Amino acid sequence: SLYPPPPPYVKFFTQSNLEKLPKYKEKKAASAKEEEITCALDYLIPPPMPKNQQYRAFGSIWQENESNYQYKIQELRKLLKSLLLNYLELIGVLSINPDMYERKVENIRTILVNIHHLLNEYRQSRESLIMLLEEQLEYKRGEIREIEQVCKQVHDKLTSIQDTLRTGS
Amino acid sequence: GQALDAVRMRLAQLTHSLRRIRDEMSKAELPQWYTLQSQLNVTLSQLVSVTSTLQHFQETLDSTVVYPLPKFPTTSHESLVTTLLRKKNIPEVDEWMKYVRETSGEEIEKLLQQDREITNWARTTFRNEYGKHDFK
Amino acid sequence: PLPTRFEVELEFIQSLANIQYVTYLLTQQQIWKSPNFKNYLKYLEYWCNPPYSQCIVYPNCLFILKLLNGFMESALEGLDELPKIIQLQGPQWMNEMVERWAN
């Protein structure tokens, strides 16, 4: 069907199984002193994390104070200059002998592809943390400073009123 | 189109009667019993007329073929189109007749003719019983 | 190879986010009638803490199951209103998820 069937073990665990789970896990721990499914109550025991700390799904694999970059910068600049130079040479190829133009085209793309690699090491979450950091920091400083400004102006008004009433005495 | 027009007007008046009985039941105070009986009987006999007239003109309704308008936009009104398109019964009625058939559960044919003869015999017996005593 | 129970339970949890899946599951009588399914739903609650929460793909179901948790004391009735209510309350629920995680 369109919707896959519920998992099979879901139907094994009734309320009686839930209430008898404590004694079952106590007995299992006492006896113990891929997990084989010898009893229907085994699944409620929390599954163990794989030792390799890896998870595979759909053909793809998955697994501290914030809780020479100049070399990369100059590499990027020289790569951009070489990319412009190669673009000029490739368009010249198109001009004179376009029949073999593709011979350079993908080459240029490789440099562009390398640029993407040069982005990968530069990857930005810390920079986003920084920018959010300063925006809420400056917002709270603005709120604070307007608080002492308003309380100070109220105090100044109170002192002026006190002087006015003392003069009228 | 004439048959569907008559179906339209009769179903419209039936829906009007339903709206009526609705807005006189929605009141916090229940009216007199007799008014409720009158409304019930009128609306229910009207439903009978609806059923009979729908029975009469099945051929005209069947002959008609449903097709969306060229001017009607389905991109924006696909939800509205699907609302009227769907026809599956409400589930509770479904398991209702499923349990009904479960409870009910050449042999069947001869039971059928035995039911025929019981029906005819009972009809004749009650005709005789009515004729036995003068009711006028 | 045969996937482990981790993979199937995680995929079930992430598929619970679909409104169509929830509507289909609640359409059948015996799914809600059977206490086994709700027992499994309450068992699934323990994935809201790390490091399990680091393995999720769509955080919305995190509330949905919790919303489904509410369904055991709110009633089936309300199944029809489920798509409308999720569409209407998507903004504030996404905001509260962001507050729970992004802050």
Binding site: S1 | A12, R19, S79, K88, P91 | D80
Partner: peptide, 25 residues
């Protein structure tokens, strides 16, 4: 003329009961 038109009694909240099953290829 027409004494009164009918009030709109649309029920979009109705969930419908369309059976879906031939999705797998």
């Amino acid at each position: 003329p027409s004494y009164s038109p009918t009030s709109p009694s649309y029920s979009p909240t109705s969930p419908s009961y369309s059976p879906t099953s031939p999705s797998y290829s």
